Ligand binder design. Structure first.
Ligand SMILES: Cc1ncc(COP(=O)(O)O)c(CN[C@@H](C)P(=O)(O)O)c1O
Ligand SMILES: Cc1ncc(COP(=O)(O)O)c(CN[C@@H](C)P(=O)(O)O)c1O
Ligand SMILES: [Cl-]
Ligand SMILES: [Cl-]
Ligand SMILES: [Cl-]
Ligand SMILES: [Mg+2]
Ligand SMILES: [Mg+2]
Ligand SMILES: [Mg+2]
Lengths: 386, 386
């Protein structure tokens, strides 16, 4: 509901809905979609994205750690939820009680879960196979055999699926991806050899699902493309269909003044005016995730690109405008004004980072406004809840 | 509250309490302290910091925008709260009904507030004078006169105080600071001329309060030094007493493995092992505010500095260890292990930023654990609340 600063994220639920629909019609009819909503749904908000993705045809959800899955569960979401990151064994009973599946891939985890098990709950798990990402998951045959051996003492753990993750699916040249693919087929053959039906197999992120044959298996795991953004600039030309960006970020001119030639703006007087300059101030800063490294970046005011001048402060930054505009004038940081569009990728490139990081780090103190069919259908202000 | 990932911030309430106490003892007995708790209390959490600061002898609170003031009010805090950033005129009634003071400095704001006023409320405000920060506040005499003129039509607005803010109080050379000081005395003279008693005057941030005579007035506004960190490395040698860092950031070894020579770690295989290497994985990433630009930074494992290797991912990163450690081994990102200490400033320097940004952007999805007299007295997990 209410928010009291004219700084907000806009999430277009139509865009998300369209992206999931187009992916669904692009992949085979017997391949499910996980909506990947970790990191506050990549800054779009856990619950509304999960809900719209499910409506668009996604059947499953994926988060980073257990607390995020519980956000969804408390919202009344009943679709399957998988935790993709590592979890401590102490989560075994709570995950089970909340119908949440964890990725489990260590004998040591199983040993500790046996010790901590409440004696009644049944927890579902997915085996992560590390096929070259080097992050988590089983890498070796002997390692797998020991893992399966420990599971013999843990009848309360039940396999729901098996997966791996690609490290280079967003690079045009495909050697490392091909290597991972071949490594993973071998890992699936180890499981077969040891008498374990994987049941439900998934490998593909946005880049992989949009590019390659033979990797859909039973399900795909879509994050960035559901939000309507390209996994990388280099594969962007080769995407099968147009992605529709869901998130924009806006503020308003909170103050506007003429500052005489030579006067300083912000901390350590890193900017001085060269003439009498129109300087506008907006209520957004690095506490909101709009970082100091974005000094000199251009925002959009009345369809024109105008530079951020002086140090970005915790809650505010300043802009050099060619002319006066009224107080309350919209300033767009990510999104479109007229003929101009600033993508999260453009912000990322100025920042020396990737679009994923730009969108995901928009702070929880910024409200989200949700648009469906051109109309505001929900507003979430997390500050109201804490 | 409960949290289900072994990744957490520790906030030492004794440190904060000691910092406020020492500042209180350092300044004159008739000078009040605003505890500045905007940006989620610089990542320490709004409410617990506000509470401990008030107990330590701070009498007033300061936030960035209205919603943050309301977090404090809903927690049962009744001490004065000032909003330091700009506010839209539509906030006039809600701020008044919640006993929150806004910074007000524009005739246009007052004009709109008159139109939006509910006919009953009395709102308190502080005049911001811009003496050289260039962000918000009145700069000119004629501008001030017009502002005071508009206030004649707004008897429901009543002055609580008058302030400015320093742009260079953390630089050793003091010319710009001295200029701001002299400019502000002129601005106070303009108010006197126009027959307005400022009532309550405040100018000084942490750096100014700890360094200079003649700038305490009726109150100081302390942020960074309450959190136990220096405003800058250059003034650190000249601080009157030792600041006690309140915040530390920790995680645990979630996975540990031996990775053969030449194998890649994480996205785009930006790291390859040069021998058979111990690679540990932790459950923290850029969605938590631990950004990709920290790749190559050294964290602490068993009192040893060990490098982050490969790309930082949304929810995880990898570390190259000299030897095997068990699962659950503590990894310290900010804080002490044995004879080693990583400050926010050290993280900031590696990141090309300042300590303010490092601490304030620790995500709302990371739980805070509050320590008083060596014991855990509170745990706040914002994900539980949303
Ligand atoms: C196991 C796993 N499966 C799929 C995805 C989704 O990727 P796309 O957004 O390109 O579809 C992720 C996460 N991707 C990054 C956010 P990160 O790996 O940095 O968390 C993941 O970890
Ligand atoms: C008007 C105003 N008065 C006091 C303080 C407190 O100062 P310290 O944190 O340096 O002790 C601030 C703080 N704000 C900066 C951190 P920023 O500009 O990055 O928000 C402020 O804006
Ligand atoms: Cl993985
Ligand atoms: Cl200011
Ligand atoms: Cl002095
Ligand atoms: Mg056997
Ligand atoms: Mg190998
Ligand atoms: Mg330990």
């Amino acid at each position: 509901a209410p928010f009291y600063r004219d700084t907000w994220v806009e999430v277009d639920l139509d865009a998300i809905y369209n992206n999931v629909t187009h992916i669904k019609e692009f992949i085979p009819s017997d391949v499910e979609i996980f909506a990947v909503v970790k990191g506050n749904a990549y800054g779009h908000d856990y619950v509304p994205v999960a809900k719209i993705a499910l409506e668009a045809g996604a059947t499953r959800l994926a988060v980073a750690f257990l607390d995020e899955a519980l956000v969804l569960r408390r919202a009344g979401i009943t679709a399957p939820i998988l935790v993709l990151g590592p979890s401590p064994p102490r989560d075994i009973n709570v995950a089970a009680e909340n119908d949440v599946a964890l990725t489990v891939f260590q004998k040591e985890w199983v040993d500790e879960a046996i010790k901590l098990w409440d004696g009644s709950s049944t927890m579902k798990y997915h085996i992560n196979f590390d096929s070259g990402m080097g992050r988590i998951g089983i890498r070796e045959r002997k390692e797998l055999k020991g893992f399966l051996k420990s599971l013999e003492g843990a009848p309360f753990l039940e396999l729901e699926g098996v997966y791996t993750h690609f490290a280079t699916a967003d690079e045009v040249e495909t050697s490392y991806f091909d290597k991972q693919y071949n490594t993973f087929l071998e890992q699936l053959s180890w499981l077969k050899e040891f008498g374990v039906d994987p049941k439900f197999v998934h490998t593909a992120n946005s880049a992989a699902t949009l590019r390659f044959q033979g990797i859909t298996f039973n399900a795909v795991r879509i994050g960035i493309a559901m939000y309507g953004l390209s996994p990388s600039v280099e594969i962007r030309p080769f995407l099968p269909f147009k992605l529709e960006p869901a998130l924009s970020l806006h503020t308003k001119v909170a103050h506007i003044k003429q500052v005489i030639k030579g006067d300083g703006i912000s901390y350590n007087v890193t900017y001085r005016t060269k003439t009498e300059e129109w300087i506008a101030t907006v209520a957004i800063g690095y506490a909101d995730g709009w970082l100091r490294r974005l000094q000199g970046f251009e925002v959009l005011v009345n369809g024109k690109r105008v530079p951020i001048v002086g140090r970005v402060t915790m809650d505010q930054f300043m802009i050099h405008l060619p002319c006066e505009v009224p107080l309350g004038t919209k300033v767009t940081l990510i999104g479109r004004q007229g003929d101009e569009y600033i993508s999260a990728t453009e912000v990322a490139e100025y920042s020396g980072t990737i679009n994923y990081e730009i969108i995901t780090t928009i702070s929880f103190r910024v409200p989200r406004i949700f648009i469906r069919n051109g109309k505001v259908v929900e507003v979430i202000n997390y500050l109201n809840d804490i």
